Design an enzyme around this catalytic site. Structure first.
Site, PDB file in Angstrom:
ATOM      1  N   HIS A 111       0.593  -1.047  -0.117  1.00  0.00           N
ATOM      2  CA  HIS A 111      -0.086   0.225  -0.511  1.00  0.00           C
ATOM      3  C   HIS A 111       0.934   0.990   0.110  1.00  0.00           C
ATOM      4  N   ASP A 123       7.023  20.695 -28.972  1.00  0.00           N
ATOM      5  CA  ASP A 123       7.940  18.850 -28.088  1.00  0.00           C
ATOM      6  C   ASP A 123       8.892  19.152 -27.000  1.00  0.00           C
ATOM      7  N   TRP A 151       7.580  -0.325   4.664  1.00  0.00           N
ATOM      8  CA  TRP A 151       7.687   1.164   3.288  1.00  0.00           C
ATOM      9  C   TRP A 151       9.498   1.348   3.170  1.00  0.00           C
ATOM     10  N   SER A 188      13.079   5.994 -14.084  1.00  0.00           N
ATOM     11  CA  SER A 188      12.296   7.301 -15.265  1.00  0.00           C
ATOM     12  C   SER A 188      12.325   7.952 -14.737  1.00  0.00           C
ATOM     13  N   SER A 189      12.471   9.029 -13.278  1.00  0.00           N
ATOM     14  CA  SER A 189      12.581   9.846 -12.369  1.00  0.00           C
ATOM     15  C   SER A 189      13.298  10.991 -12.921  1.00  0.00           C
ATOM     16  N   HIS A 205      13.242  12.669   3.136  1.00  0.00           N
ATOM     17  CA  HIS A 205      12.128  14.092   3.544  1.00  0.00           C
ATOM     18  C   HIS A 205      11.988  14.776   2.238  1.00  0.00           C
ATOM     19  N   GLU A 250      11.565  13.925  -0.697  1.00  0.00           N
ATOM     20  CA  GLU A 250      10.606  13.113  -1.039  1.00  0.00           C
ATOM     21  C   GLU A 250       9.077  13.519  -0.942  1.00  0.00           C
ATOM     22  N   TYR A 265       8.388  16.458  -0.186  1.00  0.00           N
ATOM     23  CA  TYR A 265       8.174  18.092  -1.018  1.00  0.00           C
ATOM     24  C   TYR A 265       7.848  18.067  -2.577  1.00  0.00           C
ATOM     25  N   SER A 269      -2.469  27.504  -6.873  1.00  0.00           N
ATOM     26  CA  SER A 269      -2.351  29.014  -7.372  1.00  0.00           C
ATOM     27  C   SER A 269      -3.600  29.211  -8.773  1.00  0.00           C
ATOM     28  N   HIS A 323      15.676  14.597  11.921  1.00  0.00           N
ATOM     29  CA  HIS A 323      14.218  14.080  12.784  1.00  0.00           C
ATOM     30  C   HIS A 323      13.454  12.832  12.550  1.00  0.00           C
ATOM     31  N   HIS A 324      13.701  12.128  11.258  1.00  0.00           N
ATOM     32  CA  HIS A 324      13.648  11.028  11.345  1.00  0.00           C
ATOM     33  C   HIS A 324      14.082   9.554  12.649  1.00  0.00           C
ATOM     34  N   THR A 341       5.710  28.677   4.017  1.00  0.00           N
ATOM     35  CA  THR A 341       4.816  27.666   3.499  1.00  0.00           C
ATOM     36  C   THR A 341       3.963  29.261   4.541  1.00  0.00           C
ATOM     37  N   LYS A 381       3.366  31.342   1.901  1.00  0.00           N
ATOM     38  CA  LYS A 381       1.865  30.885   1.035  1.00  0.00           C
ATOM     39  C   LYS A 381       0.319  30.787   1.341  1.00  0.00           C
ATOM     40  N   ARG A 427       2.882   1.302  15.864  1.00  0.00           N
ATOM     41  CA  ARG A 427       2.929   1.391  14.807  1.00  0.00           C
ATOM     42  C   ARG A 427       2.765   0.645  13.814  1.00  0.00           C
TER      43      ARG A 427
HETATM   44  C1  HEA Z   1       3.518  15.106   1.625  1.00  0.00           C
HETATM   45  C2  HEA Z   1       3.048  15.435   3.330  1.00  0.00           C
HETATM   46  C3  HEA Z   1       4.350  15.779   4.292  1.00  0.00           C
HETATM   47  C4  HEA Z   1       4.913  17.115   4.308  1.00  0.00           C
HETATM   48  C5  HEA Z   1       4.913  18.433   3.439  1.00  0.00           C
HETATM   49  C6  HEA Z   1       5.683  17.725   5.154  1.00  0.00           C
HETATM   50  C7  HEA Z   1       6.171  18.495   5.913  1.00  0.00           C
HETATM   51  C8  HEA Z   1       6.540  18.506   7.042  1.00  0.00           C
HETATM   52  N1  HEA Z   1       6.745  17.465   7.766  1.00  0.00           N
HETATM   53 FE1  HEA Z   1       7.100  15.768   7.307  1.00  0.00          FE
HETATM   54  N2  HEA Z   1       6.518  13.758   7.298  1.00  0.00           N
HETATM   55  C9  HEA Z   1       5.558  13.270   6.552  1.00  0.00           C
HETATM   56  C10 HEA Z   1       4.787  13.694   5.697  1.00  0.00           C
HETATM   57  C11 HEA Z   1       4.854  14.954   5.358  1.00  0.00           C
HETATM   58  N3  HEA Z   1       6.091  16.160   5.558  1.00  0.00           N
HETATM   59  C12 HEA Z   1       5.489  11.792   6.596  1.00  0.00           C
HETATM   60  C13 HEA Z   1       5.263  11.017   5.834  1.00  0.00           C
HETATM   61  C14 HEA Z   1       6.349  11.468   7.040  1.00  0.00           C
HETATM   62  C15 HEA Z   1       6.929   9.719   7.732  1.00  0.00           C
HETATM   63  C16 HEA Z   1       7.100   8.449   6.735  1.00  0.00           C
HETATM   64  C17 HEA Z   1       7.859   7.608   7.633  1.00  0.00           C
HETATM   65  O1  HEA Z   1       8.020   7.912   8.882  1.00  0.00           O
HETATM   66  O2  HEA Z   1       7.259   6.400   7.472  1.00  0.00           O
HETATM   67  C18 HEA Z   1       6.898  12.314   7.301  1.00  0.00           C
HETATM   68  C19 HEA Z   1       8.010  13.041   8.701  1.00  0.00           C
HETATM   69  C20 HEA Z   1       7.667  13.801   9.081  1.00  0.00           C
HETATM   70  C21 HEA Z   1       8.585  13.836  10.894  1.00  0.00           C
HETATM   71  C22 HEA Z   1       8.903  13.148  11.683  1.00  0.00           C
HETATM   72  C23 HEA Z   1       7.941  11.980  12.518  1.00  0.00           C
HETATM   73  C24 HEA Z   1       8.455  10.977  13.226  1.00  0.00           C
HETATM   74  O3  HEA Z   1       8.183  10.229  12.585  1.00  0.00           O
HETATM   75  O4  HEA Z   1       8.746  10.990  14.407  1.00  0.00           O
HETATM   76  C25 HEA Z   1       7.881  15.191  11.367  1.00  0.00           C
HETATM   77  C26 HEA Z   1       7.596  15.206  12.837  1.00  0.00           C
HETATM   78  O5  HEA Z   1       9.215  15.098  13.523  1.00  0.00           O
HETATM   79  C27 HEA Z   1       7.008  15.517  10.686  1.00  0.00           C
HETATM   80  C28 HEA Z   1       6.879  16.596  10.724  1.00  0.00           C
HETATM   81  C29 HEA Z   1       6.431  17.592   9.000  1.00  0.00           C
HETATM   82  C30 HEA Z   1       6.753  19.684   9.145  1.00  0.00           C
HETATM   83  C31 HEA Z   1       6.406  20.047  10.400  1.00  0.00           C
HETATM   84  C32 HEA Z   1       6.297  19.878   7.425  1.00  0.00           C
HETATM   85  C33 HEA Z   1       6.541  20.926   7.221  1.00  0.00           C
HETATM   86  O6  HEA Z   1       6.673  21.192   6.356  1.00  0.00           O
HETATM   87  C34 HEA Z   1       4.733  21.206   7.604  1.00  0.00           C
HETATM   88  C35 HEA Z   1       4.923  22.840   7.562  1.00  0.00           C
HETATM   89  C36 HEA Z   1       2.802  23.196   7.481  1.00  0.00           C
HETATM   90  C37 HEA Z   1       3.021  24.674   8.674  1.00  0.00           C
HETATM   91  C38 HEA Z   1       3.840  25.113   9.611  1.00  0.00           C
HETATM   92  C39 HEA Z   1       1.803  24.836   8.458  1.00  0.00           C
HETATM   93  C40 HEA Z   1       1.629  25.992   7.850  1.00  0.00           C
HETATM   94  C41 HEA Z   1       1.479  27.287   8.307  1.00  0.00           C
HETATM   95  C42 HEA Z   1       1.467  28.363   9.295  1.00  0.00           C
HETATM   96  C43 HEA Z   1      -0.153  28.960   7.911  1.00  0.00           C
HETATM   97  C44 HEA Z   1       1.690  29.685  10.010  1.00  0.00           C
HETATM   98  C45 HEA Z   1       2.899  29.295   9.836  1.00  0.00           C
HETATM   99  C46 HEA Z   1       3.293  29.203  11.075  1.00  0.00           C
HETATM  100  C47 HEA Z   1       3.794  29.037  12.286  1.00  0.00           C
HETATM  101  C48 HEA Z   1       4.780  29.510  12.188  1.00  0.00           C
HETATM  102  C49 HEA Z   1       4.561  27.911  13.964  1.00  0.00           C
HETATM  103  N4  HEA Z   1       7.434  14.707   8.835  1.00  0.00           N
HETATM  104 CU    CU Z   2      10.770  14.651   7.386  1.00  0.00          CU
END
Ligand code: HEA
Ligand code: CU
Ligand code: PTY
Ligand code: PTY
Ligand code: CUA
Ligand code: ZN
Lengths: 58, 236, 100, 56, 535, 48, 268, 124, 117, 338
Positions: free
Chosen positions: E64, E94, E129, E159-160, E243, E245, E247, E258, E292-293, E318, E321, E440
């Site tokens: 999955h 093209d 995974w 491919s990518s 990480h 990835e 993004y 947008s 932080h992972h 962010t 944005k 988990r």
């Molecule tokens: C694709 C979606 C995605 C995105 C975009 C991000 C980006 C970010 N991720 Fe990532 N993250 C994942 C999906 C994603 N992550 C996944 C799947 C994992 C783990 C996979 C695995 O373990 O197998 C992971 C990993 C991961 C962890 C590891 C957790 C752990 O296992 O212990 C953590 C925190 O520890 C974290 C946090 C964040 C944060 C803070 C962002 C930031 O980029 C997001 C920030 C968002 C905002 C801040 C909101 C907007 C803010 C405002 C509206 C105003 C501003 C606010 C202030 C300034 C306070 N992510």
């Molecule tokens: Cu991460």
């Protein structure tokens, strides 16, 4: 003629009516073995990946 | 402690470290709630005022003072959050005089415990193994997938230093109430510390994936008085 | 950055040189797209522009735009008491007197 | 007079930012003085009655 | 033979996007059904569907994850919307390297066969995974299963990489008469940034997986502590890719939103340069934070501080944005079509999911939330509600321009509401279960965690109904699609202004800020013969 | 032959077998493949 | 655009590639290679005559691509000033990713170098594993690579000044002087006293100095193609885009070797 | 008068060749000084340009919101039925009984567990 | 394949761009080996004529319905991007002038007409 | 702890070169300013210590850039550059002294010096148009400023909130020792060659970009390499490579510069410890004076020489002197007993 067949193969690759990989009268030797062996290679990797799902070894 | 049926929040704490974690979390949620309420109100206003509007303001597109203000305030919020985090990170640890040591070797699908002290001259160190009671052999009242045949027993108001290692794969030692979560790597020794303030029973589970029976490896820690600890030690 | 008395001159100059209905509608569309409500002189030039291009619906809709651009109702009634000779001379009828 | 209106979106923006922050501060000053502080008070009262039993 | 030279031996860039779409639908349906199998086993305590096999539960989770991170989102968002829209936006007939695009497509079906064959030949590949080394050895997984799953991550990488290199080299030297690299639309910038991250992040993954393969099959002792190695090294070599990835899956989404907020709210985007700089900063600070992972593995006390400081700083761009999007929707007029609904739902759900990120970045707090469903609830709000919502918005936005056939508005709205409700019911209780201490990757759980698990298995059955209704919506689009444009005024790209009369509107209908909506109803095969001109 | 049905890899109108069969079989196979693997692995390990 | 008969020729300087069947065939060959390699290591095949066939077919696929890419530029005549720059950008962006795989192995070497495990005695190259003396053949290889880099610049300056004999000798010497590098590094793998599986040292020493080997065999093939194509009058005094790409590759390989010789052979 | 009176109930049913005639008959009647136009002409002229026909129709009508709402409710009922059907047929282990979850309370009460918010394992 | 060209006044297609041959023992020149769209560019750059124009659109005056800006196109249509009279004031609006109708640019009002070559 | 002390040195050393590139000449002014005030820090470091000056320098830099924002006058810009250089000099000297103090062992010092000097190169790329006229650059540089602030706050928490003699051989007397003169001057010659090369090269920035990465790689690697290989040998190779490159490309010059810097910086403390008082703080002033003086004085002379005797002849003379500097560096292998 001389070593400059460049001005003669440039008049053949233009106005040929065939794809550029099968136009010259030498592409047979490159294209028959390649497509012949590709079929066997692809038909042997599907005979063993369906033969492995059933647990049969060699 | 034991999980509760319809849980919503943390478990009850028995160590200073867990109280620190709870306080820091409750501090951050303040600012997070502030931000969420602000954004939600702006969307509500946009929907209620500016839906199917006759006038379109197609020349408000630059801004100069407002772009300073949505770039400086999040910075100060991050700084305020960062101060207590650094204080907690550097402050709380085994600063002075660890009092007792328990080695927790994590094998495939059970735990092994050694008490590094309490040795004789011939090497009779107290040691045992903790397994899981299956469903078929449970007595009346025992919890399922959390109850073991041998349980760790420790004193109240004494520092305990856990050393974690593994012999097969990467395991994880967790006890949520005590605020303990460390890894068990195949070739390294990790350590954590805990102090317990009240008597009770504390349950825990593994974290990192290790194979088939990864869901059946409970941890059970009992905190008894000094007299009961002496009686327990004089029998094993 | 532009002032009230430069806005209210640029737009009279623009309304006095439009030659088609497309141009009048275009100039009216971005006149009601600022922070400033147009002064009665600008609307007075707009009605004459709509008269040269020979359109009636636009002269009625220019007044329907003021009801939404204005903050309150006393201001809307104050517009209608300065642009009263112009309406009764050109012949423009408001929407709420037609009920279409 | 009543035939001179200049700026009305700026005031709207200021009033819509001065209500989304007061409302948020109200919703966040309930999390810290109605859900957090009484819990800590209850915990600390619990720990100072457990010590009296042991003392006696 | 005309079929073969046109859909198998192909060179046109817009005829490969359709095949990417058809592949993505299949590989998304498969993963969604695997997720349903997951949620019908975590319904009530006991052994319900999979009779007693705790293997075959980890295989389902791994499949999955892979089928829906690697075979659905990237092919849908960089394949379908990049290959079809980037050339038309920049005025290129093209791309620079057509045969490389064709190979980029065709490497994928050979990769899905390996993944499906790693789940049938023996017990399988239940390593998760992230394929950690000491478990994916030859003592726990002895068979042709982990190897055949590593070879499905090699082909996708090729491919990518080829696609990203193609995009970067096309967006530079293949532009129109007057397009400098500051007048580009935002979607092109998003594709360029994701391509740069793809170039800088994939070789590390290739090295890590190949070293693991050598350790498995040739006894090299890279990750074996009996010869002088450390497993933790693998973690580093994984998360340098891990990480960036996360993004690559969200940046192409951002650009789509947008465009929508600039169409149905008739206003230009507030601070375009600000948003290009914000995306650049978000991308660049996404390579400096990968540890932080691993907070629980025993890192130093002076390395946690740097990583907890460098993770919170991402919130600034962010926030820029999000605030810019609210600013652009503020003054203008809003009309609630089916793409605007997804645009609105993105802005709130992504915020709720990302605000959970700032709580997990602290090294002090991650001791209470690591390996717990708080993380699952965190990343489903940003992935299932941040990326998939953008994909649905893009489909509902650009389908009529590509196919020439319109869709029923009512069934689209019904599907949107069903998906919203189901996804919100399915992921919120995970936060509570995480706070109470549920680990988990466990098939069975104690009796206490039952109740919320009974609520999270109710939303999945709503999301699948939404998927079936989506299938019917596509069916109703293709058949009798020409007669669906008069049912609702949602077909219109832009309503008439206040003074713009109907007669004048019917003569001048499309007012746009990009080439996309001026092309013919299906875009012509050779679209630009004489070049486009810009001032 | 440019038109609204000329860019798709499949035929939708003027067709012997109606389109509903090809459309439905695609989704049926896609959603039924993940159950076949579970059946194969369950029958290979004794349990049912 | 106001030239008289201008509509008879293309109105933009780019290449519209014709339909080719090579992507599908390369994909099928790679699928066969992946499945056969994944099975053969755990039984299920027995005979080793299928993996070799798969590798051969893949290599043939690349060669048959390159035939068309050469015919489209030397005979049909579709390589304007824009297409050439695009090709250069593409090659540089491939070489960058080719370099980044080496940084991973260097990091894996410095992570095991600093912080050695308790199982091994706390010392690099440990007891029982004698390293390779750097005052031997690894000195010859460095001199040979420097000379090879020096001889191919004589070929590129012998083609702009319009000398034919002087472009062929340099290419011949460069090919025959990289063959000595391959030979000297293939007779130093037979005189070793440590294997792939004796430690982490011997598992990284043969994983960063074995990939360089494959990339050198690629150089030999590329230079053979350049000599064969210059012999038959394909290169002009101002249009030769194989020579530049094959010169940018040799210098990268030399710079990588100068890091594989300071970090692997000296430091320990 | 019949051609122009009551265009609001007849305008969209006419062909595309009977609309240009009306538009080109009202375009040479507006050239005259206004106050010479009948009231019906004024209403028709307003309707043709700024009215609720064609590109000024609403996206959602009153009879479409009901359709959407009653579609979503029907979509929820099917999922509820399927989940209930899968819920009746379950494996209930021996621990999910009240008489067992009352003894666990006694055990967790002897050892003081959760002196704060609470311990209770009774959910039947 | 046919008569070889000498300047871009006798080049009527790809048949007039083959060229003479080099001599055995010399490095050939681009003026003796160039066939398609390469020798066209080469012949254009030896006289001063640029075959591929890259001059952006006119931003000097606006366009009325009597005096519209003329855009040359070898097709019935051409895409035109307008940005204003001082050349960067108006935001970008895209238009499709064709042979039966003119573009008008809803913001500033400049009118573009199509000239068929 | 020890790692934190390094992060601070990285930020401080990055800042100075980031300001060099920014300008807004003014940089020429900033450098002289540094020479003038650097010597004094030896007295301050010995008595007050490093940590008080270290964090004060950052806030002085912040108020300096605030003065930049406030006033656009040329005299105000010059005064801002002067204060900025004062803060940079204090921060650099204090950071070098403190990092030397923390890592007593020579090998650890050689390890940390490379990572410290990496910020010196990083500042060149990070902030050339730092805080430009358009607000977009301020917005883009805001996130990195926030990171710097948070790491500095971590330093403040460690050092302050929580619990964490006389120099002999004067500067002229120190110069009387030939080893000190050789070691200090080698860096100055190496920097002077490239500094004179840079301005005249474009007439005869994009090319210099690879040199930034080359310097980082060289500084990182040679800090570890030098102890095992022999520190004098790395300098002997590097100076001759710089001379060869200069006499007659940017990446090679940068990598050789990394050679010389990593070889010459840590070795100075070894001589001071062996044959002089056990003081780390005072010695770095000579090296810093060499760094600042090389770039402050000489680029103008190099530009004047270029197009008068010609760029090739200026490069030839610089390469000749650099190549001839190699024999002197051999004496740095071992110091005499003392
Ligand atoms: C694709 C979606 C995605 C995105 C975009 C991000 C980006 C970010 N991720 Fe990532 N993250 C994942 C999906 C994603 N992550 C996944 C799947 C994992 C783990 C996979 C695995 O373990 O197998 C992971 C990993 C991961 C962890 C590891 C957790 C752990 O296992 O212990 C953590 C925190 O520890 C974290 C946090 C964040 C944060 C803070 C962002 C930031 O980029 C997001 C920030 C968002 C905002 C801040 C909101 C907007 C803010 C405002 C509206 C105003 C501003 C606010 C202030 C300034 C306070 N992510
Ligand atoms: Cu991460
Ligand atoms: C992984 C390495 C793959 C190497 C790909 C080539 C790298 C350079 C790319 C490049 O610019 O040239 C392409 C040639 O590639 C090629 O001919 C070979 C590409 C296929 C290599 C095998 C891929 C295995 C996966 C052009 O390709 P083009 O034909 O579009 O140029 C049309 C001509 N005008
Ligand atoms: C990694 C796996 C894939 C590796 C293959 C990478 C191939 C990159 C090819 C880049 C070609 C760039 C290019 O356009 O070159 C054309 C021909 O080149 C060529 O034809 C060069 C052929 C190179 C073949 C290399 C095959 C290696 C396969 C591995 C062997 C082991 C130009 O031709 P031109 O314009 O200069 O001619 C004009 C004379 N008028
Ligand atoms: Cu085993 Cu966890
Ligand atoms: Zn315009």
């Amino acid at each position: 003629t001389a070593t400059e067949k460049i001005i003669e193969l440039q008049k053949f690759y233009q106005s040929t009516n065939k794809p550029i990989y099968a136009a010259h009268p030498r592409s047979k030797y490159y294209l028959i073995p390649y497509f012949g062996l590709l079929g066997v290679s692809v038909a042997a990797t599907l005979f063993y990946t369906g033969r492995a799902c059933f647990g049969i070894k060699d | 402690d034991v999980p509760t049926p319809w849980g919503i929040f943390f478990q009850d704490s028995a160590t200073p470290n867990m109280e620190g974690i709870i306080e820091l979390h409750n501090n951050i949620m303040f600012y997070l709630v502030l931000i969420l309420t602000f954004v939600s109100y702006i969307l509500y206003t946009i929907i209620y005022n500016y839906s199917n509007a006759t006038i379109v303001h197609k020349y408000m597109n630059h801004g100069q003072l407002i772009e300073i203000v949505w770039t400086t305030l999040p910075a100060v919020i991050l700084l305020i959050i960062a101060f207590p985090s650094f204080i907690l990170l550097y402050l709380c640890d085994e600063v002075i005089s660890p009092a007792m040591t328990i080695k927790a070797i994590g094998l495939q699908w059970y735990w092994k415990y050694e008490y590094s002290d309490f040795i004789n001259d011939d090497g009779e160190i107290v040691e045992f193994e903790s397994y899981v009671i299956p469903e078929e052999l449970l007595e009346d009242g025992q919890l399922r997938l959390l109850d073991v045949d041998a349980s760790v027993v420790v004193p109240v108001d004494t520092h305990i230093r856990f050393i974690v290692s593994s012999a097969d794969v990467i395991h994880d030692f967790c006890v949520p109430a005590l605020g303990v979560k460390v890894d068990a790597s195949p070739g390294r020794l990790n350590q954590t510390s805990a102090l317990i303030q009240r008597e009770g029973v504390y349950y825990g589970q593994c974290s990192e994936l290790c194979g088939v029976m990864h869901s059946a490896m409970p941890i059970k820690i009992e905190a008894v008085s000094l007299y009961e600890f002496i009686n327990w030690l004089d029998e094993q | 950055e532009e002032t009230y008395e430069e806005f209210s001159q640029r737009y009279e100059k623009e309304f006095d040189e439009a030659y088609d209905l497309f141009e009048v509608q275009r100039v009216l569309n971005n006149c009601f797209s600022y922070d400033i409500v147009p002064s009665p002189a600008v609307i007075g030039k707009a009605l004459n522009a709509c008269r040269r291009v020979n359109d009636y619906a636009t002269a009625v809709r220019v007044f329907e735009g003021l009801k939404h651009k204005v903050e309150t109702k006393e201001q809307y009634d104050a517009y209608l008491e300065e642009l009263k000779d112009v309406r009764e001379e050109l012949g423009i009828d408001l929407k709420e007197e037609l009920f279409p | 007079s009543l035939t001179r209106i200049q700026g009305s979106v700026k005031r709207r923006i200021l009033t819509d930012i001065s209500v989304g922050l007061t409302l948020g501060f109200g919703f966040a000053s309930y999390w810290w003085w109605g859900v957090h502080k009484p819990t800590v008070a209850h915990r600390e009262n619990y720990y100072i009655e457990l010590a009296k039993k042991k003392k006696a | 033979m005309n079929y073969i030279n046109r859909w198998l031996f192909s060179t046109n860039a817009k005829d490969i996007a359709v095949l990417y779409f058809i592949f993505a639908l299949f590989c998304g349906l498969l993963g969604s059904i695997m997720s349903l199998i997951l949620r019908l086993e975590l319904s009530a305590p006991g052994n319900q569907i999979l009779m007693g096999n705790h293997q075959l539960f980890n295989v389902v989770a791994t499949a999955h994850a892979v089928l829906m991170v690697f075979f659905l989102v990237m092919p849908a968002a960089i394949g379908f919307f990049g290959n079809y829209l980037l050339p038309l936006m920049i005025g290129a007939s093209d791309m620079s390297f057509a045969r490389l695009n064709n190979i980029s497509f065709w490497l994928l079906p050979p990769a899905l066969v390996s993944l499906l064959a790693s789940a049938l030949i023996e017990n399988g590949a239940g390593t998760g995974w992230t394929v950690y080394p000491p478990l994916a050895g030859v003592q726990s997984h002895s068979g042709p299963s982990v190897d055949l799953a590593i070879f499905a991550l090699h082909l996708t990488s090729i491919s990518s990489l080829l696609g990203a290199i193609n995009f970067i080299t096309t967006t530079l030297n293949m532009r129109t008469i007057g397009m400098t690299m500051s007048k580009l639309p935002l979607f092109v910038w998003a594709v360029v940034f994701t391509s740069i991250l793809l170039l800088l992040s994939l070789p590390v993954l290739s090295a890590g997986v190949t070293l693991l393969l050598l350790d498995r099959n040739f006894n090299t002792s890279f990750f074996e502590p009996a010869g002088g190695g450390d497993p933790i090294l693998y973690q580093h070599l994984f998360w340098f890719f891990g990480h960036p990835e996360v993004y690559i899956l969200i940046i192409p989404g951002f650009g789509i939103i947008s465009h929508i907020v600039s169409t149905y709210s008739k206003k230009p985007v507030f601070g375009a340069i600000g948003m290009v700089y914000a995306m650049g900063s978000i991308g660049f600070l996404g390579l400096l934070v990968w540890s932080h992972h691993m907070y629980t593995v025993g890192l130093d006390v002076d390395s946690r501080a740097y990583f907890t400081s460098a993770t919170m700083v991402i919130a600034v761009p962010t926030g820029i944005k999000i605030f810019s999007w609210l600013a652009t929707l503020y003054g203008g007029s809003i009309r609630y079509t089916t793409p605007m609904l997804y645009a609105f739902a993105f802005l709130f759900l992504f915020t709720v999911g990302g605000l959970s990120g700032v709580v997990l970045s602290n090294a002090s707090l991650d001791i209470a939330f690591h390996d717990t469903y708080y993380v699952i609830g965190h990343f489903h709000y940003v992935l299932s509600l941040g990326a998939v919502f953008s994909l649905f918005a893009g489909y509902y936005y650009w389908s009529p321009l590509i196919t020439g056939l319109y869709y029923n508005n009512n069934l689209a709205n019904i599907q949107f509401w069903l998906l919203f409700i189901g996804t919100n019911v399915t992921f919120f209780p995970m936060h509570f279960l995480g706070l109470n201490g549920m680990p988990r990757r466990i098939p069975d759980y104690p009796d206490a965690f039952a109740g919320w698990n009974a609520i999270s298995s109710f939303g999945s059955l709503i999301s699948i109904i939404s998927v079936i209704l989506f299938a019917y919506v596509i069916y109703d689009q293709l058949v009798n699609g020409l007669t669906n444009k008069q049912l609702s005024t949602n077909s219109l790209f832009k309503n008439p202004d206040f003074i713009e009369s109907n007669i004048i509107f019917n003569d001048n209908s499309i007012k746009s800020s990009s080439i996309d909506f001026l092309l013919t109803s299906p875009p012509l095969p050779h679209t630009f013969n004489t070049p486009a001109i810009q001032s | 032959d440019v038109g609204p049905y000329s860019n798709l890899p499949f035929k939708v109108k003027n067709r012997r077998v109606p389109y509903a069969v090809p459309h439905f079989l695609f989704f049926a196979i896609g959603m039924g493949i993940p159950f076949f693997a579970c059946y194969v692995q369950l029958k290979r390990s004794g349990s049912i | 655009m106001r030239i008289q008969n201008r509509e008879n020729l293309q109105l933009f300087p780019f290449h519209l590639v014709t339909n080719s069947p090579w992507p599908l065939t390369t994909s099928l060959a790679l699928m066969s290679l992946a499945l056969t390699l994944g099975l053969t290591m755990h039984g299920y095949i027995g005979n080793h005559l299928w993996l070799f066939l798969a590798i051969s077919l893949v290599l043939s696929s690349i060669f048959l691509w390159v035939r068309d890419v050469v015919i489209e530029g030397t005979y049909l005549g579709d390589h304007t000033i824009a297409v050439r720059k695009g090709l250069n950008i593409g090659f540089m962006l491939f070489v960058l990713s080719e370099i980044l795989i080496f940084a991973a192995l260097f990091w894996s070497y410095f992570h095991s170098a600093m912080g050695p495990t308790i199982e091994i005695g706390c010392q690099w190259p440990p007891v029982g594993i004698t390293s390779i003396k750097p005052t031997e053949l690894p000195l010859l290889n460095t001199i040979i690579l420097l000379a090879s880099g020096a001889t191919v610049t004589w070929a590129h300056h012998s083609i702009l000044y319009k000398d034919r004999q002087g472009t062929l000798v340099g290419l011949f010497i460069t090919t025959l002087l990289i063959i000595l590098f391959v030979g000297c590094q293939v007779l130093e793998y037979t005189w070793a006293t440590f294997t792939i599986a004796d430690s982490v040292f011997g598992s990284i020493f043969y994983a960063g100095t074995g990939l360089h080997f494959i990339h050198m065999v690629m150089l030999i093939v590329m230079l053979a193609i350049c000599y064969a194509r210059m012999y038959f009058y394909h290169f002009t005094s101002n249009h030769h885009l194989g020579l530049e790409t094959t010169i940018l590759y040799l210098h990268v390989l030399d710079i990588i070797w100068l890091f594989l010789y300071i970090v692997f052979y000296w430091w320990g | 008068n019949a051609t122009v009176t009551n265009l609001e109930k007849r305008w969209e049913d006419l062909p595309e060749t009977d609309q240009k005639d009306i538009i080109s008959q009202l375009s040479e009647r507006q050239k005259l000084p206004w106050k010479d136009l009948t009231l019906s002409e004024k209403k028709a002229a307003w309707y043709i340009s700024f009215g609720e026909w064609g590109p000024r129709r609403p996206v959602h009508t009153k009879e479409d919101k009901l359709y959407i709402f009653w579609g979503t409710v029907i979509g929820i009922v099917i999922s509820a039925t399927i989940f209930g059907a899968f819920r009746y047929n379950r494996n209930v282990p021996k621990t999910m009984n009240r008489e067992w979850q009352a003894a666990s309370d006694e055990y967790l009460k002897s050892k003081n567990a959760e002196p704060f918010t609470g311990y209770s394992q009774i959910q039947s | 394949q046919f008569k070889t060209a000498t300047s871009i006044a006798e080049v009527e297609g790809l048949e007039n761009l083959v060229g003479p041959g080099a001599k055995t023992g010399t490095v050939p020149t681009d003026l003796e080996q160039a066939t398609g769209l390469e020798r066209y560019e080469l012949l254009g750059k030896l006289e001063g004529i640029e075959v591929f124009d890259e001059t952006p659109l006119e931003a000097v005056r606006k366009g009325t319905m009597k005096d519209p800006i003329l855009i040359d196109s070898y097709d019935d249509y051409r895409y035109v991007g307008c940005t204003g009279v001082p050349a960067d004031s108006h935001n970008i609006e895209w238009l499709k002038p064709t042979t039966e109708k003119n573009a008008r640019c809803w913001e500033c009002g400049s009118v573009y007409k199509l000239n068929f070559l | 702890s020890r790692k934190l002390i390094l992060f601070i040195v990285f930020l401080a050393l990055l800042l100075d070169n980031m300001l060099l590139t920014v300008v807004v000449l003014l940089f020429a002014s900033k450098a002289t300013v540094q020479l003038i005030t650097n010597p004094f820090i030896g007295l301050l470091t010995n008595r007050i210590g490093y940590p008080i000056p270290i964090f004060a320098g950052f806030c002085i830099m912040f108020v300096s850039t605030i003065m930049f924002a406030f006033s656009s006058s040329y005299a105000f810009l010059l005064i801002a550059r002067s204060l900025q250089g004062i803060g940079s000099s204090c921060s650099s000297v204090a950071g070098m002294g403190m990092l030397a103090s923390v890592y007593t062992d020579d090998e650890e010092r050689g390890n940390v010096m490379g990572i410290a000097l990496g910020g010196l190169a990083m500042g060149v790329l990070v902030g050339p148009p730092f805080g430009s006229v358009l607000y977009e650059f301020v917005g883009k540089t805001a996130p990195f400023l926030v990171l710097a602030a948070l790491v500095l706050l971590d330093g403040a928490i460690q050092l302050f909130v929580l619990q964490p003699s006389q120099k002999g051989t004067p500067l002229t007397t120190l110069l009387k020792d030939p080893y000190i003169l050789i070691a200090a001057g080698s860096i100055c010659f190496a920097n002077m060659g490239i500094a004179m090369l840079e301005p005249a090269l474009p007439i005869w920035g994009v090319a210099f970009l690879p040199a930034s990465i080359s310097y980082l790689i060289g500084t990182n690697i040679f800090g570890i390499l030098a102890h095992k290989m022999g520190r004098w040998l790395c300098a002997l190779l590097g100076m001759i490579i710089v001379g060869v490159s200069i006499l007659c490309p940017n990446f090679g010059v940068g990598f050789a510069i990394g050679m010389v810097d990593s070889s010459m910086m840590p070795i100075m403390g070894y001589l001071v410890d062996l044959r002089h008082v056990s003081v780390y703080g005072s010695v770095y002033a000579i090296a810093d004076v060499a760094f600042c003086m090389g770039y402050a004085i000489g680029p103008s002379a190099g530009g004047a020489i270029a197009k008068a005797i010609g760029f090739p002849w200026l490069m030839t003379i610089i390469g000749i002197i650099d190549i001839l500097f190699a024999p002197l560096c051999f004496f740095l292998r071992s110091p005499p007993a003392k």
